[PDB]
Write a protein that binds this ligand. Structure first.
Ligand SMILES: Nc1nc2c(ncn2[C@@H]2O[C@H](COP(=O)(O)OP(=O)(O)NP(=O)(O)O)[C@@H](O)[C@H]2O)c(=O)[nH]1
Ligand SMILES: CCCCCC
Ligand SMILES: CCCCCC
Ligand SMILES: [Ca+2]
Ligand SMILES: [Ca+2]
Ligand SMILES: [Ca+2]
Ligand SMILES: [Mg+2]
Length: 166
């Protein structure tokens, strides 16, 4: 049909797995089990096109990060996730983007910046800060909550729409 390989990256605990599971399985994972490397597949209609999403959920914990680069290499677009209550995860985004560019050997890779956990109130990253970072990269910024499902479909579908502009 039409396949899009999406890779979700970002610091440990920011909600990469919760986001992916909300999209694919329609429930919220409350517990924290660090990921090594997991894959999901779903057929969905996006803007009138039937397509197959292959989503790679990657490790954010350094200790679990072995060989992540080898998984990142096959990606067609990347969700770069931080949590709005985790300033360090936002600062880390630069390093994840740089890794993406290294493994893709390109400065032109479809990406979306995602600020997750927007249901929480201990915000330390303001929307405008993230919008500015995204603007510097030439990509959209979207806020999500894996818990309430706010923005979850939007983030992944926006990434598909970015891949289509490549
Ligand atoms: N309130 C709230 N909690 C969230 C949200 N997303 C994830 N969490 C919580 O944050 C914790 C970590 O989520 P998880 O998805 O495992 O993070 P991760 O980025 O996949 N971690 P890792 O890189 O180690 O695999 C879990 O307790 C999960 O319930 C969110 O949008 N809101
Ligand atoms: C480490 C954060 C800096 C952002 C650079 C694009
Ligand atoms: C501090 C996170 C950087 C990730 C690059 C492998
Ligand atoms: Ca649950
Ligand atoms: Ca390389
Ligand atoms: Ca390469
Ligand atoms: Mg995970």
């Amino acid at each position: 049909m039409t396949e899009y390989k999406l890779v979700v990256v970002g610091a440990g605990g920011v909600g990469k797995s919760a986001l992916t599971i909300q999209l694919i399985q329609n429930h919220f994972v409350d517990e924290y089990d660090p990921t090594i490397e997991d894959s999901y597949r779903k057929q969905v209609v996006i803007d009138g096109e039937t397509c197959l999403l292959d989503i790679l959920d990657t490790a954010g914990q350094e200790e679990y990060s072995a060989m992540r680069d080898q998984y990142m290499r096959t990606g067609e677009g990347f969700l770069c996730v931080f949590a709005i209550n985790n300033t360090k995860s936002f600062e880390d985004i630069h390093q994840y983007r740089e890794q993406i560019k290294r493994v893709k050997d390109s400065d032109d890779v479809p990406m979306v910046l995602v600020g997750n956990k927007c249901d929480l109130a201990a915000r330390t990253v303001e929307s405008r800060q993230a919008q500015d970072l995204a603007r510097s990269y030439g990509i959209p910024y979207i806020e999500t909550s894996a818990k309430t499902r706010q923005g979850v479909e939007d983030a992944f579908y926006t990434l598909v729409r970015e891949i289509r502009q490549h």
